[PDB]
Structure 1
Amino acid sequence: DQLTEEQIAEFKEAFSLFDKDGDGTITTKELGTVMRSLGQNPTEAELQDMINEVDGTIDFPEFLTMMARKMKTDSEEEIREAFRVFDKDGNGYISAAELRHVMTNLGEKLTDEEVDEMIREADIDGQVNYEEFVQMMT
């Protein structure tokens, strides 16, 4: 919980914007909203991860702990960058043909079924916009 004096006061103000009754509690259906109020763009899967590490409300202390853990972890960035390894011209697209080659030949090799499924889900001439494919698997 290695947050600064300033982060803690920032999170306390953000938490209390949604603590209406003032009872040091917010609903989990508002967790996304407070994090977006703090200039974050948490993923649907980032938020389930958090909303599930609590078996439906959140007290300020388990919020501060989520936020401290979320600082110490930047999934959108890292997947984009993993894709950018195989994107030479740097344009943020990758051919359906090179993408297929890399997924069926490197790492935990995808089957021909799994990649046929991957490429369909990446729209488009047959060039994959991978920044939007990051959005898909969130």
Structure 2
Amino acid sequence: CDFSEEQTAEFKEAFQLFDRTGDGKILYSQCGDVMRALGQNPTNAEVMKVLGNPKSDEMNLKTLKFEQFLPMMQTIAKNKDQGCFEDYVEGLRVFDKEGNGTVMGAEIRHVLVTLGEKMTEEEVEQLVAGHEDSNGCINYEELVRMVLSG
């Protein structure tokens, strides 16, 4: 495998933190959580593709191991379709009306819930939380800068 052992040890240590799985295994639905916590930013489509296009019911009746999870993360790191933050900060400007580097939080919540891969109301609230202001607007630039540092 084209992956050093130094970071592999830390990856194994992080994967062993779940525990709640019977033993050294991992569920299909919980695979994305461990894949996104270690690093990278895979999408739902990418997760379903690397997982071999699992069935709807297969996401809760089977479990994988680490020998199969390592190549998944390897491919996600090597092969990816993400992009830098320069394109993200410029994409959110489409919703800016006045053009003063601010956008309404409700519009961002709606765009995140409907447009794209859709997100639950529990996640969008935590995402937009903290950036509350008097005018109810959230600077997309600061939002992207904070999300990139996460």
| Number of residue pairs aligned between Structure 1 and Structure 2 | 98
Which of 63, 67, 89 is the matching residue for 2:69? 63
Return the structure number with greater helix share: 1
Question: Which SS does the other structure have where 2:9 is aligned?
Answer: helix
Structure with bigger gyration radius: 1
Cα deviation, residue 64, structure 1: 0.8
SS in 1 for 2:64: strand
Q: Percent identity?
A: 39
Give the whole-Å Cα distance in 1 for the aligned partners of 2:37 and 2:15. 10
- Tell me the alpha carbon deviations over residues 1-60 of structure 1, each in whole angstroms, 9 at most, x when there is no partner: 211011211221122112335622110111111122213332111111122266721111
CA distance in 2 between counterparts of 1:7 and 1:58 reads 21
Does the residue aligned with 1:66 lie in a helix, a strand or coil? Answer: helix
Structure 1 stretch displaced more, 67-76 or 47-56: 47-56
Please give the TM-score of this superposition, normalised by the length of structure 2. Answer: 0.49
Alpha carbon RMSD of aligned pairs, Å? 3.6
Residues 16, 22 of structure 1: 8 Å contact kept: no
TM-score, normalised via structure 1 length: 0.52
Compared with structure 1, are the counterparts of its residues 54 and 66 closer, same or farther at alpha carbon in structure 2 (3 Å cutoff)?
farther
For 1:2-21, what aligned pairs fall within 5 Å after superposition? 2-20=2-20
Query: Which of 62, 76, 80 is matched with 2:82 structurally?
Result: 76
